[PDB]
Amino acid sequence: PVLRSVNSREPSQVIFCNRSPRVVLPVWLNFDGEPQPYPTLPPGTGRRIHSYRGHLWLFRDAGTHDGLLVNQTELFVPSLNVDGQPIFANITLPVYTLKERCLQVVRSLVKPENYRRLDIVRSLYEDLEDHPNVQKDLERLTQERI
């Protein structure tokens, strides 16, 4: 397991700031590197959260499981606090591919049983059916580091 938190015993105060228009699901990777869902952040708010140094986090659209960004990257790892200053996690939309973005909208308008009714190619139908997923994306992020 390449992508995992590190047991540290040193607390790190963090500010999760949701500057996406969506409800955000913070996802803490455990020491085994298994995603752990945490309480959702409503759009346009922030919370101070108690995490630990070296702990690895990831953020996503609580509804669609769409990919988000934190400090213009995909993973957030709190640094050691400097003189008690809280670290800041700025959560934002990425620039989705036109395709992925369209899928998002179609998926949001059409019931999954009706994907069948759209006059589109089978490949597109499969893409519509293939909902985004933290685990699939974690596997991809490993190969992008390997």
Partner 1 sequence: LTKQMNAIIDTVINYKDSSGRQLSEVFIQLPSRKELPEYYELIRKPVDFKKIKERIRNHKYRSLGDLEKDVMLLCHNAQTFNLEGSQIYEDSIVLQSVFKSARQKIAKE
Partner 2 sequence: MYVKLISSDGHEFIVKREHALTSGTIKAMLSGPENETNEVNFREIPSHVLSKVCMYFTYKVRYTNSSTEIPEFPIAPEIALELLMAANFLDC
Partner 3 sequence: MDVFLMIRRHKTTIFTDAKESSTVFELKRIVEGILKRPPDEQRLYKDDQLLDDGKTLGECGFTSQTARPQAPATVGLAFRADDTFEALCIEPFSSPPELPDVMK
Interacting residues with partner 1 (CB under 8 A) = 1, 4, 6-9, 11, 13, 31-33, 48, 73, 81, 84
Shorter beta-carbon distance to a second copy: residue 81 or 124: 81
By a kind-dependent CB cut-off of 5 to 8 A, residue 94 interacts, out of partner 2, ligand A1BB4, a second copy, none, with partner 2
- Say how many residues touch partner 2, by CB under 8 A: 35
Cα-to-chain-centroid distance, residue 77 = 13
Does 39 help bind ligand A1BB4 (rule: CB under 6 A)?
yes
Does 85 help bind ligand A1BB4 (rule: CB under 6 A)?
no
Residues ≥6 apart with Cβ < 8 Å to 26: 16, 38, 39, 40, 41, 49, 57, 58, 59
Does 131 help bind partner 3 (rule: CB under 8 A)?
yes
**Alpha carbons 35 and 134: distance in angstroms, whole number:** 8
**Alpha carbons 32 and 50: distance in angstroms, whole number:** 20
Structure tokens at 25: 């699901």
Shorter beta-carbon distance to partner 2: residue 54 or 94: 94
Asked whether the beta carbons of 61 and 69 are under 8 A apart, the reply is: no
By a kind-dependent CB cut-off of 5 to 8 A, residue 133 interacts, out of a second copy, partner 3, partner 2, none, with partner 3
Q: Please identify which residue in 5, 12, 17, 27 interacts with partner 2, judged by CB under 8 A.
A: 17
Cα-to-chain-centroid distance, residue 113 = 26
Q: Please identify which residue in 76, 103, 107, 138 interacts with a second copy, judged by CB under 8 A.
A: 76
